[PDB]
């Protein structure tokens, strides 16, 4: 029933940089604070138990300190494999509670994406529904407009992302486009294409159906 | 070394019934609890619950009470989590955990529920059929449910160019998402690609070769 209220709720930082992650406890809470990273949909890890001692094998550039009610985690000089959820939680009792989570992003150069296109495969096609894929590879940063268009006509509605996360060594995301039609539909068409536009460049790939 | 295995979970129908099972290796002492924490899918952590399983003394979060219920069997080394009247609410990964009687310094790996009524359905799967030196190719793996699917490529000897999107929810309130891997364009046709897609909640697996089209 105690709050733990986390600053900043994401952040980005170039490697090298310093991070500091801030934590504070809407009552006392000694010093019965503990830090923890998580990698998506991964177990999170033990960084710091009671505000400040590092646990067994984590790299000397975490630090943790406290301040009567608030409590920070530094990272002296982050890398690129330190991108992740970091949350801090209290254990005065046991009622534990939890901090919202501070999702680190690492900061990079631009990176134009690799562009590719994949018709439906004729499996699909004899189930009635296309589906028409376009990749993103190993770009930065994360923001970047993809648009479908067929026989040069701007679609919209029947299209979903999807999002890597950050590559652990290169710092760079990948997505995939996917457009939905029917059969029907996509026999009627012969162009179909996908659009990249990041800054000033604009990428488009494409097929012609049937060649 | 120390070791926490979670096993139960998957998916059940809301007002349904689940137990966890969390298996304890390595531990050089019983002067520790036993935790479960859940994260619902793009949400934070949330503890659950806690025992000292060495003499019955539990713990509960509001949002579970008198609904969930944490044991010990200190015979079999295994904490539970009885878990009633499912809400939707309740979907999440839910996690076993220890800490001294410290932090959470081991946890299990984690264990999918997914409270809904909706069908398990196994995935179709479908190639990615594959300019410079670079060529890209991959599995689209379409309209499964529930969560989740892996994939490999070539048995686990291809792994370097990997990438395995998160899935997306259809509107059609199935699961998709691809699979894909960049390779040498001269490597086409001399090497045979194959993506091995799991969905163990359909007991389903599905070898896919991906050949040029
Ligand atoms: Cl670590
Ligand atoms: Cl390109
Ligand atoms: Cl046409
Ligand atoms: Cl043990
Ligand atoms: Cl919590
Ligand atoms: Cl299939």
């Known amino acids: 029933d105690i709050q733990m209220t986390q600053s900043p709720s994401s952040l980005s930082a170039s490697v090298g940089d310093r991070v500091t992650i801030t934590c504070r406890a809407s009552?006392?809470?000694?010093?019965?604070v503990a830090w923890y990273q998580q990698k998506p949909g991964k177990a999170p890890k033990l960084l710091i138990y009671?505000?400040?001692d590092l646990y067994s094998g984590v790299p000397s550039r975490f630090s943790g300190s406290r301040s009567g009610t608030d409590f920070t985690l530094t990272i002296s000089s982050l890398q690129p494999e330190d991108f992740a959820t970091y949350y801090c939680?209290?254990?005065?009792?046991?009622?534990?509670?939890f901090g919202q989570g501070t999702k680190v992003e690492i900061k990079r150069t631009v990176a134009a994406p690799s562009v590719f296109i994949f018709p439906p495969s004729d499996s699909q096609l004899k189930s009635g529904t296309a589906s028409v894929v376009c990749l993103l590879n190993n770009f930065y940063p994360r923001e970047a407009k993809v648009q479908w268009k067929v026989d040069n006509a701007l679609q919209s509605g029947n299209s979903q992302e999807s999002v890597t996360e950050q590559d652990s060594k290169d710092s760079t995301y990948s997505l995939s486009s996917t457009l939905t039609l029917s059969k029907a539909d996509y026999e009627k068409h012969k162009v179909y294409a996908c659009e990249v536009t990041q800054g000033t460049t604009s990428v488009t790939k494409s097929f012609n159906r049937g060649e | 070394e120390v070791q926490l295995v979670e096993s139960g979970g998957g998916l059940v129908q809301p007002g349904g019934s689940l137990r966890l099972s969390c298996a304890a290796s390595?531990?050089?002492?019983?002067?520790?609890?036993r935790h479960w924490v859940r994260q619902a899918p793009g949400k934070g952590l949330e503890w659950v619950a806690s025992?000292?399983?060495?003499?019955?003394?539990?713990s509960y979060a509001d949002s579970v009470k008198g609904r969930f219920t944490i044991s010990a069997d200190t015979s079999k080394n295994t904490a539970y989590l009885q878990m009633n009247s499912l809400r939707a609410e309740d979907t999440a990964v839910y996690y076993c955990?220890?800490?001294?009687?410290?932090?959470?310094?081991?946890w299990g790996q984690g264990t999918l529920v997914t409270v809904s009524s909706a069908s398990t359905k196994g995935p179709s799967v479908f190639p990615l059929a594959p300019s410079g030196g670079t060529a890209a190719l991959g599995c689209l793996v379409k309209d499964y449910f529930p969560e989740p699917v892996t994939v490999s490529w070539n048995s686990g000897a291809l792994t370097s160019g990997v990438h395995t999107f998160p899935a997306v929810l259809q509107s059609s309130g199935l699961y998709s998402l691809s699979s894909v891997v960049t390779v040498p364009s001269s490597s086409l046709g001399t090497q045979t690609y194959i993506c091995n897609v799991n969905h163990k909640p359909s007991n389903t697996k599905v070898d896919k070769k991906v050949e040029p089209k």
């Open positions: 025992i000292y399983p060495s003499y019955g003394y539990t």
């Open positions: 009671s505000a400040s």
């Open positions: 390595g531990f050089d002492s019983g002067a520790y609890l």
């Open positions: 009552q006392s809470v000694s010093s019965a």
């Open positions: 955990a220890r800490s001294a009687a410290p932090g959470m310094d081991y």
């Open positions: 939680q209290q254990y005065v009792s046991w009622l534990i509670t």
